[PDB]
Write a protein that binds this ligand. Structure first.
Ligand SMILES: CC(C)CCC[C@@H](C)[C@H]1CC[C@H]2[C@@H]3CC=C4C[C@@H](O)CC[C@]4(C)[C@H]3CC[C@]12C
Lengths: 27, 158, 137, 34, 185, 175, 86, 48
């Protein structure tokens, strides 16, 4: 469970990174 | 069955994605640097020159801020495989460890204050060397990721 | 700690990395493992995922430690190091010898089984004398 | 069945909290309305 | 925006009401083995009211459940009446009605609030009904299991809580808009 | 060698308890969010941070925020009580499991088999063993014989291969 | 809770009673008993004494509850309601 | 923190041990219980 959560956290951080980058490039 | 080595392999598998991300960022930044370099470097417009210089400085700062995590995380991998007594993987990983150590602690640039220096950067030799190093490192990290996955599965099933 | 550091550096809340560097990440994780509190808790979904799974891990591990220690302290179990003779041949910490000038030594001497051949080798190459002169001895 | 009591107590506390909240909301709205 | 959130709220209300009514009416909550099956017993699939034998000579026949220590008596009564799941469904219906009214009396903002309160209370009642059901089943004949009706009830609970959240957010946005407009005016 | 299952650490508490724990977590978080963000009377208790606070409460960790209202504090208090009871029960029942698993003394002698009765033991119907037990003047084997010829229905057997097969089929219930 | 309230009202740190009124005192005590944390901890020696003894009490009581529950769940004991005729 | 964790866990565990053992204790209630055990001695009149 710990490893799965770490991997999911990395994935969600990547998603947030892309989303925030796009929203900022909009700004 | 589940054991210490298998957990080490799982954790290294999770952390190697970060190294892949770092090298991909490296190559993207160096592709941008090449787009700036091979493209005409005329600085007739003071505003254009200032913008180009600040872009170069920003990219250099980003790369410098982003190097220590890679090297230290790979050192963590080496330490883990030492403690778990996985000798083969440790042997495969020691050469890159020493290469990173040498790269960080030599500063072949005469300035010897930063690994990447905006003034020394934009040089074709240094740019191309960094590009090739990043590409080879990406290939190595992909191969090591798949090797770690295979070893994890092997250790689990047995 | 490393994953929290990465997730907070390159995907910050938006500042968010002066908090949850590597040092403070290690500190947060350690304070979590020891059931203490925190001077900082993550605000991003990824850091919060990491913290939640770490919290579950800590809870389970501390409970298991306490429970198994209660078991140990409640039930005494003394294990004999030896339950056979091969175990006795492999072991070198424990010494063993027969009565000197007897039928048991004559048995071990003329043996053909591997284990007793090893025991005879040991008893013939043992210092001091494992052998004995009387049963009471 | 061993720990149903804590569930009942918890749900009772939740209902009580919601009721207290609505009471405070009505009372405050009436007071600020005058 | 507000319109899409209200649409999701109404859809969730309808879906949760339907799922909970299905689960209550349906008789596929528990798969077990019972003595009264005509041959420890025969396989049965049960529900809140009636039990049906499967894989047996009396296959397909469904019979009303024969319920029946003050606390045990109260638990048996509550389990028989099934008043808590029924209350959950009723509250979901009333909340959906209040939302529909909020789609008309756009001025009165204390309606989409009642909807959220009712949805949350319905979720709580569903929790209580699940606890009562599980507690009552136990007694003191193994390898039992839960059916898709039980998970329909769980899904209803989750949806009710979600739509309560959305309704409360709608109330927040609407009250904020009105208050800011008034103060700035 | 019983291979412990992954997710055997959940064995101290039944599946239903975990299910209802999740349900109660969701309900607690929603009720906290509601009773904190309804009255246009700020509060950091949205739905994300309500979930965070509830989760941290369940793990006996605590987080940065804490309720300040009466309703929010009622919710937090009952959740705290629930968490305390549940965690204590988990630890205690796990200790029970391990302690009992540590008491278990297998059969290692005729006496251990003699006193207990959860396992049945029988020998060949015709043979020297039946006669030896029948004609025994020893206490333990006398007790065995007293047990022997009981309603297994048939502890005895006719063929040795039959006894071996019966022991193999029995899940440790025959010796 | 009451003693903390009094000690913090009439002997404040010097403000110190808007924190550790009766409501927040009850909250602090409850959070202590349940092994949770605190959004406020006392700064005066008297409030800190109160908190320390409450902390010791909580620790002992929770440990005792868990231990005796483990005992109960480990050893089954069925008592007959009757051991005589009276 | 490590010290505290170990010490509190040890206290709880040893208290559980104490109470569990105090709950196992089955006093003497028959001739058999006296017969098997030997921590207590039993003897009758010399002549009788
Ligand atoms: C292990 C990886 C990640 C890094 C170290 C690998 C070494 C062998 C790599 C890194 C960068 C590489 C150099 C990059 C650029 C060039 C281009 C040209 O001049 C010939 C080869 C040469 C000079 C490469 C030789 C091999 C090289 C030195």
């Amino acid at each position: 469970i710990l490893i799965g959560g770490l991997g999911l956290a990395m994935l969600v951080a990547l998603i947030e990174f892309c989303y925030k980058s796009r929203s900022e490039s909009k700004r | 069955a589940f054991t210490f080595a298998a957990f080490c392999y799982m954790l290294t598998l999770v952390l190697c994605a970060s190294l892949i991300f770092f090298v991909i960022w490296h190559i993207i930044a160096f592709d941008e640097l090449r787009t700036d370099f091979k493209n005409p470097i005329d600085q007739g417009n003071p505003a254009r020159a200032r913008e180009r210089l600040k872009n170069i400085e920003r990219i250099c700062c980003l790369l410098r801020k982003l190097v220590v995590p890679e090297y230290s995380i790979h050192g963590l991998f080496c330490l883990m495989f030492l403690c778990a007594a996985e000798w083969v993987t440790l042997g495969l990983n020691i050469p890159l460890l020493f290469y990173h150590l040498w790269r960080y602690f030599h500063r072949p640039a005469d300035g010897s204050e930063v690994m990447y220096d905006a003034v020394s950067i934009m040089n074709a030799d240094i740019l191309n060397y960094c590009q090739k190093e990043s590409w080879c490192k990406l290939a190595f990290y992909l191969l090591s990721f798949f090797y770690y996955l295979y070893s994890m599965v092997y250790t689990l099933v047995s | 700690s490393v994953v929290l550091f990465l997730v907070s550096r390159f995907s910050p809340y938006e500042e968010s990395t002066n908090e949850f560097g590597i040092f403070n990440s290690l500190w947060f994780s350690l304070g979590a493992f020891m059931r203490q509190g925190c001077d900082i808790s993550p605000r991003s979904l990824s850091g919060r995922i990491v913290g939640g799974v770490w919290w579950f891990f800590t809870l389970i591990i501390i409970s298991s430690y306490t429970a198994n220690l209660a078991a140990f302290l409640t039930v005494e179990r003394m294990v004999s190091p030896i339950e056979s003779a091969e175990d006795l041949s492999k072991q070198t910490e424990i010494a063993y010898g027969t009565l000197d000038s007897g039928s048991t030594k004559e048995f071990f001497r003329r043996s053909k089984i591997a284990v007793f051949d090893k025991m005879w080798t040991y008893m013939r190459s043992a210092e001091p004398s494992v052998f004995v002169r009387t049963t009471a001895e | 069945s061993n720990v149903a009591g804590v569930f009942y107590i918890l749900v009772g506390g939740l209902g009580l909290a919601m009721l207290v909240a609505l009471i405070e909301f009505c009372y405050k709205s009436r007071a600020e309305a005058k | 925006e507000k319109g899409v959130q209200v649409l999701l709220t109404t859809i969730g209300a309808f879906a949760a009401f339907g799922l909970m009514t299905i689960a209550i009416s349906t008789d596929y909550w528990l798969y077990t083995r019972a003595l009264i099956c005509n041959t420890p017993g025969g396989l049965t699939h049960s529900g809140l009211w009636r039990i049906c034998c499967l894989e047996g000579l009396k296959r397909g026949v469904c019979v009303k459940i024969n319920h029946f220590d003050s606390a045990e008596y109260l638990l048996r009564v509550v389990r028989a009446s099934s008043i808590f799941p029924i209350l959950s469904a009723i509250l979901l219906l009333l909340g959906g009605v209040c939302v529909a009214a909020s789609r008309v009396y756009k001025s009165k903002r204390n309606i989409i609030l009642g909807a959220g309160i009712l949805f949350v209370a319905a979720g709580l009642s569903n929790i209580i009904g699940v606890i009562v059901y599980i507690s009552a089943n136990a007694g003191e004949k193994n390898h039992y299991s839960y059916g898709w009706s039980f998970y329909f009830g769980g899904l209803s609970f989750i949806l009710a809580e979600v739509i309560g959240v959305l309704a409360v957010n709608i109330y927040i946005e609407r009250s904020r808009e009105a208050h800011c407009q008034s103060r700035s005016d | 060698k019983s291979k412990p299952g992954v997710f055997s650490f959940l064995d101290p508490l039944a599946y239903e308890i975990w299910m209802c724990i999740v349900f109660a977590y969701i309900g607690v978080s929603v009720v906290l969010f509601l009773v904190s963000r309804f009255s246009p009377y700020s509060n950091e208790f949205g739905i994300f941070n309500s979930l965070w606070f509830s989760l941290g409460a369940f793990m006996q960790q605590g987080c940065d925020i804490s309720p300040r209202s009466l309703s929010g504090r009622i919710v937090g208090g009952v959740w705290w009580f629930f968490t305390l009871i549940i965690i204590s029960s988990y630890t205690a029942n796990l200790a029970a499991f391990l302690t009992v698993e540590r008491m278990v003394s297998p059969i290692e002698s005729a006496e251990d088999l003699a006193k207990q009765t959860e396992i049945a033991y029988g020998t060949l119907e015709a043979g020297s063993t039946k006669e030896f037990f029948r004609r025994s003047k020893i206490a333990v084997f006398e007790k065995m014989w007293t047990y022997m010829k009981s309603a297994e229905p048939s502890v005895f057997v006719r063929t040795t291969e039959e006894g071996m097969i019966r022991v193999r089929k029995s899940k440790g219930k025959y010796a």
